[PDB]
Design a protein around this nucleic acid. Structure first.
Length: 1258
RNA sequence: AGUAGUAGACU
């Protein structure tokens, strides 16, 4: 293992005095501070000046458009729908619709569908409402739930419905008339979802009786609650109809005693990409979600009025969004509840609480892109007007770069404008959705964060957001080429000098860097690295540059990689693992990272861009690169990671909130003392110490060639420079980058060149690829960039110390985002002796004391920003704030304090589950709620989320009396059923937060076993029989539910190899051939290829419609149902009769807040036992740090197992089973200010926080 | 007609 000798980077040993002289000249100049001061008049004026020049940008519209995705009403307290009530209500409703005289085509097709339903035969009405086992296809009813109407039986208007498959219009928001109208409409809706319709572990539950009273017992009565339970029914019917074989037919369902009818039209199925399900409703006008201007019509039928809504078309995303809408609104309102009680100190009153619930529900039902964009902008507008200086001018200017199509948008504009003006005018903090003033700032921003998270990800239009991601890369590449044809290639790759600045031919733009600044920044970082030479030499060795490639985890993953160039002109799209198996089938060795770089470097760095599907209003990047690109980036990030481990001010490679708040605490500690100065004559001038947080924010405009001169000048504590020159040669190869436009866009552009399309097509010069230079490629160089930023800030600190040595200032930072702290110095007294000192310095040559007389922190920021710009870093003038109190870093609101939003974690427990069974999804959903308990959510919220997500799962599978309700079959009570047999979850939060998830199963088994060992009773034998049936087919079994190189090894070969080499169940092979076999065994695993062939995560959650009755459980080599698995379970458990196998498996036994850590190699030891032949032992030795303490530590572990359990691993059956026990042995916890990192002081905090208003001692 | 958009789409 030798590194070849690459060419080093030429250097030019700079002088700090030259750049100090430049900075002195730069400070005696005219520089205006880029952030404006925040005044109420300036904010009102910005709203006026944007509002007046507004309507000339768009065309005025005549009516506000649609925003409700479904309309409906309720006669009273809703009762959910069974199959019998569906049939009777459908007959009632189609009798009522046949009395209509049709006019508008919706009425025509509703009358036709109802007529054909009332022609249905006596024996088809049976097969309409029939389970899909006894079902049998008849004349008009081919699927259960559908019928078959035909287009020869249709009124001429109905075929018009079937066949109906420059500036934008916008409501004038500058007009008080239209603002009053849209506000009146939305207040009518929101006022209508609040009417009191009327109602239809023991410690935690007694307190939860107090939360359930003050929350659920008030919100259980409202109209919004029952309408949410109704939308759930309508969406269950739509999801049923959206399958493949069903969607090609018609349907009619009815709800609420025949008060709401749902007509579903034939449509293309939702299993395929880009399809819709069209439908409409017919309903009695009354209490509901009604928007009367987007109803199709209203008729009068024997006195009562009926609303016919429009024909809606919905995608698969918004359908699941509306299916979970009740749960989302309820979870977000309970979140609001906790924040309010924490803030004010008691429970909210029922009037504001009901209005909050209704607002959340309306947002959950709209689900439009244009409202998501509004809340996206609002979370930036809120800190920009409560800060001292900020860029609110440009933010409010971007708030107006949209049309306001519907009426909910104009209503949102009004309430947002009022909130922003009232925030700038003024602690005191007005809420947005109620009439509540807050105390702390965190409550108000948390409210807007909660409203932003109610919107699903990916609401953007596909072919219009897929073109908007290529645009940024193309236009920054145009900028770079402009600079290259103006300055020449050498100044682009090498940088300018300070003499070029002051001659005046180069200016400090953004895609250009300074030679002196880069090298002197490296020199400051070097002065921090020269100290810890030992640890720095020992980190560069522990990255292992001679461990072979492909034998790391990351190089054999599931992450997507480009492949070889096709025929159409694009790249392939394989997976990391496929290209790992593809290289090894001609490599002939398993080479290491330097020898793969030496192997694959004549190829250029291809890349491709693929949407991240975020919720923010402009969707971002994510690149997919080839293998040679991934090699070079591996080399560079490994080097820079080893170096950046020992630098405290770099926060990428580095449990972030702990270190952040240590930095804040240090900085607040500096401003306790009081600096002062003695003058020439001996005047003693006293000063104060202030702080000024600059929450910075920002990167495609950034030359990647500054890193070469930064890398070559870094001290690393090595005996030579053969690795450094290889890192430089790797960086010299990521300069240029071929960029490929995706197939979707290339097709789309050909399905139609205006003006903005034609220049974009001229960039690619009539191909699919074009070269970019000096590109960052999203996060593929993050450790580099954050170390470079921290270096430049250190350079600034020393330069400020050497311009004003008299003044004992301060400085600190944090480069994830970024948070700079400036410890400036206030003259304290009112007397002019400070101004006289500034005079006495300003005549005596020191002209640069001109920028320090007044304000002064502005000059710290100006010089810091200029040095950062000389290193190509541009601080954003739009989303930066400046205030002497609050701060925001990497999505956490700091105030000195800490506050995580955590609502993302809850709203992810309802949406998106892995789809791997009942047990698997139950565990994932409950693990989300424990994780949200970690981050701020009090025991009762995580309890409510546990209850809700568990109920969602048991209804999504049917194990509740339903299709798979196991208590119909089994002789054990629901308490005693194991989990993976659809049993009761045995669910709590105060146990899952402390123990694990699979403890309760242990309990069930344990109970029977212990009862058995004392009584030999009968149902306990049955519990053991169920557990044995689980083990035949987690610390028990689980029921199983429902690619180029995928069979180079027949399955018997993989089984025989799995027996011959059972050490590899812990350890990745280092040789080639065991690796090729170990990797095909990783393919043929069908959990893995399940995770590859079902990549869009909506499809699997939606195919939980089919996965009910369908043959979806493995049993005896047969896909069967779920009911026959329970049949087989009861059979075996009543025919079972036996202990010590069971014994070896049972014998594993209001203040402000801060952030602590809760805590209750190894795999190489557990491999050392199964080490048998010489190759396997050499693999175990490579896999281990100190490879000769190993045979000691195993013995140390051995008796340790006998220490507290009572087992021997010198029996082979024991050690295969309790390997998870010894994997399992730091979840960060946002806990109050009087908590210590020991787990027994966090567990007391959780118990003390069971009551939100009353005190608890323990 | 719905989703979407100041980039021509889909049912």
């Amino acid at each position: 293992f030798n590194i070849p000798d690459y060419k080093p980077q030429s250097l030019c040993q700079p002088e700090i005095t030259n750049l100090i002289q430049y900075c002195k000249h730069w400070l005696t100049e005219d520089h205006d501070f880029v952030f404006k001061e925040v005044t109420g008049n300036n904010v009102m004026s910005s709203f006026e000046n944007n509002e007046d020049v507004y309507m000339s940008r768009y065309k005025e519209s005549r009516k506000p458009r649609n925003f409700l995705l479904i309309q409906g009403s309720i006669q009273g307290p809703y009762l959910p729908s069974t199959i019998s009530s569906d049939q009777c209500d459908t007959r009632i409703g189609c009798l009522e619709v046949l009395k209509v005289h049709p006019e508008t085509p919706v009425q025509a097709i509703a009358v036709d569908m109802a007529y054909k339903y009332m022609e249905l035969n006596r024996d088809e009405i049976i097969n309409y409402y029939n389970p899909r086992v006894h079902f049998q296809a008849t004349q008009s009813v081919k699927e259960p739930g559908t019928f078959k109407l035909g287009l020869s039986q249709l009124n001429p208007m109905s075929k018009s419905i079937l066949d109906q498959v420059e500036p934008l219009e916008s409501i004038n928001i500058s007009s008080q008339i239209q603002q009053n109208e849209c506000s009146r409409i939305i207040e009518s809706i929101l006022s209508n979802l609040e009417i009191n319709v009327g109602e239809v572990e023991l410690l935690g539950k007694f307190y939860e009786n107090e939360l359930s009273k003050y929350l659920i017992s008030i919100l259980r009565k409202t109209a919004a609650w029952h309408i949410g339970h109704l939308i759930r029914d309508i969406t269950e019917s739509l999801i049923a109809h959206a399958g493949l074989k069903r969607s090609k037919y018609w349907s009619i369902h009815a709800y609420d005693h025949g008060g709401v009818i749902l007509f579903i039209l034939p449509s293309k199925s939702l299993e395929v990409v880009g399809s819709y399900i069209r439908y409409f409703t017919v309903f009695k006008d009354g209490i509901g979600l009604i928007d009367e201007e987007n109803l199709d019509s209203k008729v009068d039928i024997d006195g009562v009025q009926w609303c016919f809504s429009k024909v809606m078309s919905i995608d698969l995303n918004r359908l699941l969004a509306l299916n979970i809408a009740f749960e989302k609104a309820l979870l977000a309102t309970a979140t609001w509840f906790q924040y309010y009680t924490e803030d004010q100190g008691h429970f909210p009153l029922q009037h504001a609480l009901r209005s909050v619930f209704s607002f959340h529900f309306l947002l959950c039902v709209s689900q439009k892109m244009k409202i998501c964009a509004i809340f996206d902008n609002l979370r930036y507008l809120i800190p920009a007007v409560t800060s001292l200086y900020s860029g609110y001018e440009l933010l409010i200017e971007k708030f107006f770069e949209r049309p306001f199509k519907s009426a909910l948008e104009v209503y949102l504009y009004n309430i947002i404008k009022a909130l922003l003006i009232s925030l700038a005018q003024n602690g005191v903090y007005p809420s947005l959705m109620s009439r509540v003033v807050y105390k702390h700032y965190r409550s108000l921003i948390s409210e807007a964060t909660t409203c932003f998270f109610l919107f699903e990800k990916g609401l953007h239009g596909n072919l219009n957001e897929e073109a908007k991601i290529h645009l940024e890369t193309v236009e920054w590449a145009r900028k770079f080429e402009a600079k290259e044809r103006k300055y020449g290639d050498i100044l682009m790759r090498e940088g300018y000098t300070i003499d070029a600045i002051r001659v005046g031919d180069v200016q400090v733009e953004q895609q250009l860097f300074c030679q002196e600044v880069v090298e002197l920044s490296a020199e400051e970082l070097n002065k921090y690295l020269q100290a810890k030479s030992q640890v720095l030499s020992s980190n560069i060795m522990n990255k292992h540059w001679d461990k072979p490639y492909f034998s790391q985890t990351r190089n054999i993953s599931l992450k997507g990689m480009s492949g070889a160039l096709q025929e159409d002109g694009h790249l392939a799209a394989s997976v990391t693992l496929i290209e790992a198996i593809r290289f090894l089938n001609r490599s002939q060795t398993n080479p290491n990272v330097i020898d793969m770089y030496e192997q694959t470097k004549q190829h250029k760095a291809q890349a491709r861009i693929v949407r991240k599907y975020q919720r923010t209003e402009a969707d971002r990047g994510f690149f997919i690169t080839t293998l040679p690109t991934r090699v070079r980036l591996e080399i560079i990030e490994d080097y820079y990671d080893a170096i950046a481990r020992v630098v405290p001010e770099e926060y990428i490679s580095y449990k972030k909130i702990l270190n952040i708040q240590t930095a804040l605490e240090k900085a607040l500690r500096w401003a306790s003392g009081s600096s002062e100065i003695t003058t020439s004559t001996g005047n003693v001038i006293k000063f104060k110490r202030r702080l000024m947080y600059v929450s910075a924010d920002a990167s495609p405009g950034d030359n990647s060639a500054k890193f070469k001169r930064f890398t070559q000048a870094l001290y690393d504590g090595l005996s030579d420079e053969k690795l450094k020159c290889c890192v430089v040669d790797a960086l010299r190869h990521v300069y240029e980058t071929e960029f490929f436009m995706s197939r979707k866009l290339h097709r789309y552009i050909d399905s139609m060149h205006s003006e903005a399309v034609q220049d974009f097509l001229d960039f690619f010069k009539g191909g699919v690829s074009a070269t970019v230079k000096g590109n960052w490629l999203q996060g593929n160089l993050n450790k580099c960039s954050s170390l470079f930023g921290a270096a430049v800030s250190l350079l600034f600190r020393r330069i400020w110390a050497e311009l004003f040595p008299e003044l004992e200032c301060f400085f600190e930072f944090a480069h994830h985002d970024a948070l700079f702290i400036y410890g400036y110095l206030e003259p304290e007294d009112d007397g002019t002796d400070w101004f006289l000192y500034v005079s006495q310095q300003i005549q005596a040559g020191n002209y640069h004391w001109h920028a320090v007389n007044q304000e002064m922190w502005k000059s710290m920021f100006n010089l810091h920003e200029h040095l950062l710009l000389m290193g190509s870093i541009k601080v954003s003038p739009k989303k930066t704030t400046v205030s002497p109190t609050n701060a925001e870093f990497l999505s956490t609101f700091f105030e000195g304090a800490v506050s995580i939003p955590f609502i993302k974690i809850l709203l992810g427990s309802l949406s998106d589950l892995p789809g791997l069974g009942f047990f698997d999804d139950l565990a994932a959903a409950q693990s989300r709620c424990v994780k949200a308990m970690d981050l701020g959510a009090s025991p009762q919220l995580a309890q409510l989320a546990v209850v809700i997500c568990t109920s969602k799962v048991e209804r999504l599978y049917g194990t509740a009396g339903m299709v798979n309700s196991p208590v119909a079959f089994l002789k054990v009570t629901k308490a005693h059923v194991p989990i993976p047999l659809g049993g009761d979850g045995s669910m709590s939060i105060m146990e899952l937060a402390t123990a694990g998830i699979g403890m309760a199963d242990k309990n069930i088994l344990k109970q029977a076993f212990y009862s058995y060992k004392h009584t030999r009773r009968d149902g306990d034998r049955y519990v053991l029989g169920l557990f044995k049936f689980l083990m035949s087919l987690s610390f028990v079994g689980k029921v199983q539910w429902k690619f180029e190189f995928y069979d180079q090894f027949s399955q018997s070969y993989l089984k025989s190899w799995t027996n011959q080499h059972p050490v590899y169940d812990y350890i990745i092979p280092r040789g080639r051939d065991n690796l090729l076999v170990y990797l095909v065994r990783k393919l043929n695993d069908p959990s893995i290829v399940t995770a590859m062939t079902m990549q869009s995560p909506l499809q699997l959650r939606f195919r939980m419609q089919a996965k009910q009755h369908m043959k979806v459980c493995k049993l005896d080599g047969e896909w069967v149902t779920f009911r026959e698995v329970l049949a087989a379970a009861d059979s075996f458990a009543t025919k079972y009769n036996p202990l010590d196998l069971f014994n070896t498996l049972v014998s594993c036994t209001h203040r402000s807040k801060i952030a602590r850590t809760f805590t209750v190699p190894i795999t190489a030891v557990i491999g050392y036992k199964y080490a048998s032949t010489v190759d396997e032992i050499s693999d175990v030795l490579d896999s281990s740090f100190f490879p000769d303490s190993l045979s000691a530590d195993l013995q140390v572990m051995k008796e340790g197992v006998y220490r507290e359990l009572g087992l021997d691993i010198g029996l082979p059956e024991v050690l295969k089973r309790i390997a998870p026990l010894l994997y399992k042995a730091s979840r960060v916890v946002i806990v109050e200010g009087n908590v210590e990192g020991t787990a027994e002081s966090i567990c007391s905090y959780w118990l003390r926080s069971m009551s939100l208003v009353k005190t608890i001692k323990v």
